[PDB]
Amino acid sequence: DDIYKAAVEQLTEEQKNEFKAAFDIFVLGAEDGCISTKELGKVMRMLGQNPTPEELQEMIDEVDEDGSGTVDFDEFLVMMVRCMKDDSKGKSEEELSDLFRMFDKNADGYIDLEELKIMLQATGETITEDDIEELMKDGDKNNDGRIDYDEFLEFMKGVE
Amino acid sequence: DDEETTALVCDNGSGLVKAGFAGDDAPRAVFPSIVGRPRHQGVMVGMGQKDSYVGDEAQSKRGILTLKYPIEHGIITNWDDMEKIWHHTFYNELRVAPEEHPTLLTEAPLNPKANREKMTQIMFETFNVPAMYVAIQAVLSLYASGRTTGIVLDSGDGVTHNVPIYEGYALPHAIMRLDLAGRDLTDYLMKILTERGYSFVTTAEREIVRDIKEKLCYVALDFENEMATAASSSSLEKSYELPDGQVITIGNERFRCPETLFQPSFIGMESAGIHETTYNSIMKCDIDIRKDLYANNVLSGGTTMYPGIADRMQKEITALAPSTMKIKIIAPPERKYSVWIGGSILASLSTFQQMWISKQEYDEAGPSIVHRKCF
Amino acid sequence: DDEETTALVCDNGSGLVKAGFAGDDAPRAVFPSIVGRPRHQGVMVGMGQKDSYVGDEAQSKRGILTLKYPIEHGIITNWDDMEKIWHHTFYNELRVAPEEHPTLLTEAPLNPKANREKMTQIMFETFNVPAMYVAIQAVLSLYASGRTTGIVLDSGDGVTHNVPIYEGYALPHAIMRLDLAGRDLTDYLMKILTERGYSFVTTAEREIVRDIKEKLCYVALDFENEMATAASSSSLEKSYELPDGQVITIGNERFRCPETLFQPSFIGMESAGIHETTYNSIMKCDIDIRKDLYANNVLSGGTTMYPGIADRMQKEITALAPSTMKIKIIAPPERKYSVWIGGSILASLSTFQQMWISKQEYDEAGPSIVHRKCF
Amino acid sequence: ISASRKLQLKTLMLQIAKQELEREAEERRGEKGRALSTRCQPLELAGLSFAELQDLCRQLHARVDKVDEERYDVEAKVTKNITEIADLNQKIFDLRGKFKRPTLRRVRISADAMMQALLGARAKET
Amino acid sequence: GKRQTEREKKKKILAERRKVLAIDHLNEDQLREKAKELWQSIYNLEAEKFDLQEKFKQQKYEINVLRNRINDNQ
Amino acid sequence: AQKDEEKMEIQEIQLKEAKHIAEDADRKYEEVARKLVIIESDLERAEERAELSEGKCAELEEELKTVTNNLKSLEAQAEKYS
Amino acid sequence: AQKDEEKMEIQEIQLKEAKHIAEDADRKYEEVARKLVIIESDLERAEERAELSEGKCAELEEELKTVTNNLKSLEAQAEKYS
Numbered sequence A: 001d002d003i004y005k006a007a008v009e010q011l012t013e014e015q016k017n018e019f020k021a022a023f024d025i026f027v028l029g030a031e032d033g034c035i036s037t038k039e040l041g042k043v044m045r046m047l048g049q050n051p052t053p054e055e056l057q058e059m060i061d062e063v064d065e066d067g068s069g070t071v072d073f074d075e076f077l078v079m080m081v082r083c084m085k086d087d088s089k090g091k092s093e094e095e096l097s098d099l100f101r102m103f104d105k106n107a108d109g110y111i112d113l114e115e116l117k118i119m120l121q122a123t124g125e126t127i128t129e130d131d132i133e134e135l136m137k138d139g140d141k142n143n144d145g146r147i148d149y150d151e152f153l154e155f156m157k158g159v160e
Numbered sequence B, C: 001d002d003e004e005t006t007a008l009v010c011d012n013g014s015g016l017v018k019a020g021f022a023g024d025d026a027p028r029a030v031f032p033s034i035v036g037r038p039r040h041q042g043v044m045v046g047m048g049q050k051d052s053y054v055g056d057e058a059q060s061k062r063g064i065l066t067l068k069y070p071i072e073h074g075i076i077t078n079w080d081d082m083e084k085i086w087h088h089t090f091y092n093e094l095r096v097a098p099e100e101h102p103t104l105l106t107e108a109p110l111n112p113k114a115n116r117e118k119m120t121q122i123m124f125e126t127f128n129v130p131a132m133y134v135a136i137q138a139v140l141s142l143y144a145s146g147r148t149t150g151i152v153l154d155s156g157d158g159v160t161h162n163v164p165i166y167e168g169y170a171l172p173h174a175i176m177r178l179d180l181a182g183r184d185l186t187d188y189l190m191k192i193l194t195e196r197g198y199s200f201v202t203t204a205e206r207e208i209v210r211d212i213k214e215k216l217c218y219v220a221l222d223f224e225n226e227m228a229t230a231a232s233s234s235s236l237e238k239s240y241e242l243p244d245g246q247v248i249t250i251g252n253e254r255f256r257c258p259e260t261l262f263q264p265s266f267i268g269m270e271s272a273g274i275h276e277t278t279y280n281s282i283m284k285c286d287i288d289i290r291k292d293l294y295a296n297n298v299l300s301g302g303t304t305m306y307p308g309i310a311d312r313m314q315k316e317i318t319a320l321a322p323s324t325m326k327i328k329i330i331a332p333p334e335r336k337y338s339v340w341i342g343g344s345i346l347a348s349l350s351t352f353q354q355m356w357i358s359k360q361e362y363d364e365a366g367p368s369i370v371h372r373k374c375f
Numbered sequence D: 001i002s003a004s005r006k007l008q009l010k011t012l013m014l015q016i017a018k019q020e021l022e023r024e025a026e027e028r029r030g031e032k033g034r035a036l037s038t039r040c041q042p043l044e045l046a047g048l049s050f051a052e053l054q055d056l057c058r059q060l061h062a063r064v065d066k067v068d069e070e071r072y073d074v075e076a077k078v079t080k081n082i083t084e085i086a087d088l089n090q091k092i093f094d095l096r097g098k099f100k101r102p103t104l105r106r107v108r109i110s111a112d113a114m115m116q117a118l119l120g121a122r123a124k125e126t
Numbered sequence E: 001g002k003r004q005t006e007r008e009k010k011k012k013i014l015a016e017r018r019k020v021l022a023i024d025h026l027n028e029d030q031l032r033e034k035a036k037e038l039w040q041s042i043y044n045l046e047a048e049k050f051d052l053q054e055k056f057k058q059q060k061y062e063i064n065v066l067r068n069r070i071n072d073n074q
Numbered sequence F, G: 001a002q003k004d005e006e007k008m009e010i011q012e013i014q015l016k017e018a019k020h021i022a023e024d025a026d027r028k029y030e031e032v033a034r035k036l037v038i039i040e041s042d043l044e045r046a047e048e049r050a051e052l053s054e055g056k057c058a059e060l061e062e063e064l065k066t067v068t069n070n071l072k073s074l075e076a077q078a079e080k081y082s
């Protein structure tokens, strides 16, 4: 998964246009102009395989994660990388636990605002306060200002 | 896939054999379990006419066959035909020789011992599998729901059984097995269709009546009101086209066929309906786990797919149960294959990998090994 | 906190184990002392099912366990289970290794020697504490009241004992130990509930009857008048919802269950009630300290928490005692944990710091050291 | 906004946490070296005849046995702690297993194989 | 019993770990060599003790985390 | 042949219409299923909050009962003392 | 003509399958919507119950504190009596 982008990292989004070239042989003639990836996979299937729409629906849902209905090229790349995973789950879960221990320097077992904010500052990423609360709710699912190992893993689920 | 070895999760059932490799979402091959010898004489020479069409092939030539199910009520009554069905399942629907694959059969609760022992003896001598394990059909359906408690009502096509489980500890004294199931509903529907003029008699036409039952029948929320409405208006009469034309119109036979589940007095059975055997199965349990069983009632099996049953059953149990408890009925959309999905999950577990009945163990203790520790 | 070393004030009790570090107000962890092995078979694989759930964990899975208390009447009848309870208390409810903490157990008066010696041998060999001391459960309850005289009636759940003390000098010839306590009241309540139709038999349902007793029962000020009133009106019938619905209505069983304390003839015991064994315990004392004991009667222990007992007992003793003496019954609101609060106070004293049974002393004289000067 | 940017942010966070873990591991190994240099009594091997060597070897063997007893006690404590950690991890697995087991379906063929089969040898990235 | 048996087993294991030290057959140079071996052994023992202390602190942290997770489950 | 051509045309038309209706139905099913899961989680949270509140209410009831009984007893004692 | 007739038969089979899929999806959608409606109503009722219980708990707290103060006053009075 990561090797595809790594080999195409020096190139731009033209690969998707190149993909359309292949699609130009099979599914040329799009009408809505919106998210539609079931057609290409179904036409690929129609060349002899057993019909199955669940896999195509899974592919067409693997892109939309923001919930707004907009599917940028980044969402397609996320679908591509999460459809085929070998060194997933952040490599080793033991490393995830070790990094969680690094996060909780106070050794209390609950991550408060200060710990996560200090780690954000150490990373230094420019993330908006709305995005900060988004991440807080994604991690702190019960939304009580504390994050355990399970909540941290859920927030870091599929994160390498 | 590749190296390694995958398990075969077969599920004999009674009416549809569902099989597939362990670790998937749906069974690979699902086909009726019927073996039908031809009954007429046959005049064309060299047509390549076989002596017995099994599985889904005999649902296309059923016009000149005499289909006969090899499994009556959970138990197996015709061992040669069942062996033929298994051979077909392994070699033609999955195309994997059984010499290199563990198998996980399923069996209804409270079945005769000899059936289970003969099943394991066949699997070890004829097909010569490496290791096989037999599991109760309700625990798997509880696996598939992702729960660990709950009382599961697995109304198959052969037999309806109701196994309560708490915290992983099954309660053997509270299993209520009732022999009313989909087949008796098919026979009763075929018997009440005669009140309009349509007579189905041949064993091939039982399949047509089964299709009518599947596509049209539904469970009424309140029986008397529906009986009164269907007798005045005509908004219920739905028509259906036979395999040759001559459409038929089903009136109040629509909700009278599956009503037999809640009033087994219709087909002359004494026992109480599936709405009251669940409450009785709960009341036999201890006084402290009744709330959890009330809240986690699970439905499974094919026959629980009637449109509107998850509401009728909840209404009935709420009528019977104390007013304070909350009654919730889990009815997943993948009800039909729930047992097989649970079987796949169980076969895919690492903790379960040492529970198989290895062949050397069978060689040392005989077929009676199944009743022993390796259950 | 920090450096230094704090003492562990454990209090085995019989029914609730109360523990916590010395110097606080309330025990840190309070949980029933029951160890229950599972009794059914268990079909789910890999569920992580343990072989014995102890403490408060077995009060949530009690539907499929067979709970059994390891302490019958003060004495300990099942040493392996008691060791398991202690191990749980130290490691999971307090999370402090015992290698670095003195312990202060408590023991009822007039108990068998072998029980105490085995207790100290376990604490020194298995858990390997630095030093442990065993104290009589009534002196602590007298500490907690901040008195120095008084006769304390410590009606626990296992055994009711009545130790009189004056000016710090205990009177060993006036201790009246009676074996009626909360457990016998639970059994008697479970036995009289059958007069309305409710049958509780399983060892798990004894917990439900205990909850009924705690929440509903009360001690009548005058027994005959209450029996007459409950038999005419219906102002007493209080209802209660079982763990599954089916509410029950308790009539005159409310004040008949705890009345057994003042008339032990109900459960067939010969002896006199707790209202007359206190007066007998006083009359065995010398003639010059009877006024002080009359004025400083102390109540403790869980079972003395019934609503309205501090008035019934005072009325009874005033009836028995001479008319001139003033009868006063001290009933602090923190009755249940009175023994443990007193234990914390005693362990926090500087004068007491040299009374512990140091390990080297045990190594030199064996377990029989407890009966020696270090009492 | 864009999922790839957020994935890159998560990857950068993981790399920063890994770098901090490596830094703290270097700190721990430095502490181990310093404590080893301090606690271990250096070998003074000047001007010692036979008898004092025998006395020193005896007392140092006794001290080795004592510190071995202490280290064995700490080892037993660590083994008990890791056993308890495994037990409680199994308990959490029991409390959070059930449906959380990975339910995977093989009907979804790998897109790489499908493109390779349909396109011959001109689908190499996947 | 077992607890006193556990104490006896522990002390016997420590006695077995006690090496049979005999210096009546070696020159002072070999005595210094044996002292160097014993010092390296105690160095390894100290390193093992420090590693055990660090892992014990890690296990205490994990125990606290597990308790917090259980409190989440409660 | 002309009959067959007409049948083919009408079959194709109805086929395309039915496929579009099927797509619409599947999309609606997915959306409503997601919303149903959300509402179910909300219901669970409401239930647990109500349970906690009722438990606290019961505890407060017990405490008030006990203290009121104490007050009654003390008042009777005070009258007798006067 | 015969070949186009055969293809027309195949088209009719496909149309029948599309009809079945459409009906099944429609039933799915209506069932899910009805269940969602029921769940939403239950959630609303549960939250209202929780609010009522919280109000009751607040009132009980007030009563408990008042009675506690009265009990302390009467305890002092009884000590004076003694």
Ligand SMILES: Nc1ncnc2c1ncn2[C@@H]1O[C@H](COP(=O)(O)OP(=O)(O)O)[C@@H](O)[C@H]1O
Residues within 6 Å of the ligand: B012, B013, B014, B015, B016, B017, B155, B156, B157, B158, B182, B183, B186, B210, B213, B214, B215, B301, B302, B303, B305, B306, B336
């Ligand atoms: N969609 C449906 N609606 C109503 N009844 C059905 C439906 N599908 C299957 N059935 C009934 O259920 C039976 C199949 O049950 P099944 O679960 O396959 O039995 P088994 O437990 O032997 O596998 C059929 O005989 C049919 O009568």
Ligand SMILES: Nc1ncnc2c1ncn2[C@@H]1O[C@H](COP(=O)(O)OP(=O)(O)O)[C@@H](O)[C@H]1O
Residues within 6 Å of the ligand: C012, C013, C014, C015, C016, C017, C155, C156, C157, C158, C182, C183, C186, C210, C213, C214, C215, C301, C302, C303, C305, C306, C336
């Ligand atoms: N609020 C209460 N009302 C009535 N009885 C109670 C109450 N609380 C506890 N009990 C009874 O007291 C017992 C607990 O007594 P306890 O003092 O814990 O015994 P121990 O001396 O062994 O600690 C319980 O078994 C119960 O029957």
Ligand SMILES: [Ca+2]
Residues within 6 Å of the ligand: A103, A104, A105, A106, A107, A108, A109, A110, A111, A112, A115
């Ligand atoms: Ca923290």
Ligand SMILES: [Ca+2]
Residues within 6 Å of the ligand: A139, A140, A141, A142, A143, A144, A145, A146, A147, A148, A151
């Ligand atoms: Ca949280």
Ligand SMILES: [Mg+2]
Residues within 6 Å of the ligand: B013, B014, B137, B154, B156, B157, B301, B302, B339
């Ligand atoms: Mg079945």
Ligand SMILES: [Mg+2]
Residues within 6 Å of the ligand: C013, C014, C137, C154, C156, C157, C301, C302, C339
């Ligand atoms: Mg006590």
